[PDB]
């Protein structure tokens, strides 16, 4: 058989690449990391360096604080027993304050306060990391696609644990930190709103999720199919169409009747994935604020 180019058949390594410099504060970048030959079979073998900076540290510190604040709670639940801790790891749960406290920041710690702390930590963690995606791009003079794409994701998360709990009048409507518990909450959230399968945003959202898989399958297999013509070197192909780009476009034109360009295909991409949580966010936001039951809504349309 023919070679498929899913895995490299010869690895090649040179002096650690410290990357483009530009407006980047080189003081902040780290030191190169070890090289992983393991990873080298798939993508790049080089680890690091990474850029630290102020926002990275804040993000990274709040990030751990969040995770740990949950962790101690799990331990307190486990009776500080490492055996129970392992047995019951997916059953533990840090739940929001009771509906009694409403949008109150005065819930006792064992009764919801600890959840607020953890969330506060996550909030700062996530937003700082957002600002990080933006700045990292600015400092290289790049488009801010990544930060805007990221914002979509942030939308759904914002809505789940912040905007919806606030518009409903209580934190109790938010998602608990826990493996099995956040699954249950999800399953239950649908039951209460009259089956999310009638939420047309939910349905839209699924279409874009399914689609993301469909597309990234299409794009990936295509680029691999024409990497025998340096297909995978997309910017240069954009700047100077190679046979790669041509065979790519034509295979698709001949199959289904229309086609992308190399820059084009990546717009299809960023929008198909970004629409998942965009539509998603909206479906959930209206759920319980404007629409109490999607089946009833489904019967009338109003």
């Amino acid at each position: 058989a023919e070679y498929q180019n899913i895995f490299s058949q010869v690895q090649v390594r040179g002096p650690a690449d410290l990357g483009m410099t530009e407006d980047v504060n080189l003081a902040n970048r780290s030191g190169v990391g070890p090289f992983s030959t393991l990873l080298g079979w798939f993508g790049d073998a080089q680890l690091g360096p990474i850029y630290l900076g102020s926002l990275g540290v804040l993000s990274l510190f709040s990030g751990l604080m969040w995770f740990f604040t949950i962790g101690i709670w799990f331990w307190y639940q486990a009776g500080w027993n490492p055996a129970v801790f392992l047995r019951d790891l997916f059953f533990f749960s840090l739940e929001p304050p009771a509906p009694e406290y409403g949008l109150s920041f005065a819930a006792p710690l064992k009764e919801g306060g600890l959840w607020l702390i953890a969330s506060f930590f996550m909030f700062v963690a996530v937003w700082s990391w957002w600002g990080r995606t933006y700045l990292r791009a600015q400092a290289l003079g790049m488009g801010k696609h990544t930060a805007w794409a990221f914002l979509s994701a942030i939308w759904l998360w914002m809505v789940l644990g912040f905007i919806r709990p606030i518009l409903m009048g209580s934190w109790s409507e938010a998602v608990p930190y826990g493996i099995f518990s956040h699954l249950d909450w999800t399953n239950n959230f649908s039951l209460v709103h009259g089956n999310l399968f009638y939420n047309p945003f939910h349905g839209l959202s699924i279409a874009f999720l399914y689609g993301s898989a469909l597309l990234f399958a299409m794009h990936g297999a295509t680029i691999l199919a024409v990497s025998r013509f340096g297909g995978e070197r997309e910017l240069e192909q954009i700047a100077d169409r190679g046979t790669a780009a041509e065979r790519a476009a034509l295979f698709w034109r001949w199959t289904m009747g229309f086609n992308a360009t190399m820059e084009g295909i990546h717009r299809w991409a960023i929008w198909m994935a970004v629409l998942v949580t965009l539509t998603g966010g909206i479906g959930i936001l209206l759920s319980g604020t404007v629409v109490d039951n999607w089946y009833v809504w489904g019967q009338n349309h109003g």
């Binding site: 993508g43 055996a83 019951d88 990544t146 990497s227 998942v276």
Partner: protein
């Protein structure tokens, strides 16, 4: 009719079946023997679907629904109005799909590229076959399959799910979802990365890839790279769908109880099974 660079690619050959017979195009479209096959299967299937619609007495697409035979029929044939029509329609779909794949193969050859696309598609086809062929057989009636209707199919999903409790607890379902989510994440990034390089800040020069790799090491301390992210995508996708099949093929066959309950195995390991406190003690 042709893209400005299409003509030099439109040469004879690459057909799997039938030589030069169907070796030709119709507008942008490539026909090929399988071009014909899929058309025929697609024609037939849509017909039968309309025919089901008159027996049902509705032309409204939100209502139309073609159901498999009821469990009483097992894996035997059933009367048209009583499940036959779905069975043929299913045969015709399969015919369509497989044929559509083989045409992709034929186009691949004419263009001289790899077969990765036909390849990946076969995973979609295999997921569909899991739900209407492999699972029902193994379970023992066409009746376990999902019906062909816009909402009725969402209903099968919901009913089939809730049969084993909250389906969220199906462990291969957990794995399959992690890919779906991960893949979307990665499609989000890849797209965004290339665009931001090709469309930099106003008045600046097209960044380069060397920028793409840098932007990510700066961000998370590693860059899977260009060839990588495309290998990654193909994989996450194919995996999502692979585990999706798996979670269903096991459901109802080797596990028919509540999925949540299957986790009792973990919690009941003799070394901590009786230790008091926590959630389960």
């Amino acid at each position: 009719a042709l893209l400005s660079f299409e003509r030099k690619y439109r040469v004879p050959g690459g057909t799997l079946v039938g030589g030069n017979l169907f070796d030709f195009w119709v507008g942008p479209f490539y026909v090929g023997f399988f071009g014909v096959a899929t058309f025929f299967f697609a024609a037939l299937g849509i017909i039968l679907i309309a025919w089901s619609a008159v027996l049902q007495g509705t032309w409204n697409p939100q209502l139309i629904s073609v159901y498999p035979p009821a469990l009483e029929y097992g894996l035997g044939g059933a009367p048209l109005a009583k499940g036959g029509l779905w069975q043929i329609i299913t045969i015709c779909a399969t015919g369509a799909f497989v044929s559509w794949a083989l045409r992709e193969v034929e186009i691949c050859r004419k263009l001289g590229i790899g077969y990765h696309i036909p390849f990946a598609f076969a995973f979609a086809i295999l997921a569909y076959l899991t739900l209407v062929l492999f699972r029902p057989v193994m379970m023992g009636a066409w009746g376990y399959a999902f019906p062909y209707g816009i909402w009725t199919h969402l209903d099968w999903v919901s009913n089939t799910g809730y049969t084993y409790g909250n389906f969220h607890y199906n462990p291969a379902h957990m794995i399959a979802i992690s890919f779906f989510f991960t893949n979307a994440l990665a499609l989000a990034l890849h797209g965004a990365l290339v665009l931001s390089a090709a469309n930099p800040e106003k008045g600046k020069e097209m960044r380069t890839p060397d920028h793409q790799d840098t932007f990510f090491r700066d961000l998370v301390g590693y860059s899977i790279g260009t060839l990588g992210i495309h290998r990654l995508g193909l994989l996450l996708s194919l995996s999502a769908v692979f585990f999706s099949a798996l979670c269903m093929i096991i459901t109802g066959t080797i596990w028919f109880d509540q999925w949540v309950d299957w986790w009792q195995w973990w919690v009941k390991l003799p070394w901590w099974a009786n230790i008091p406190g926590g959630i389960n003690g």
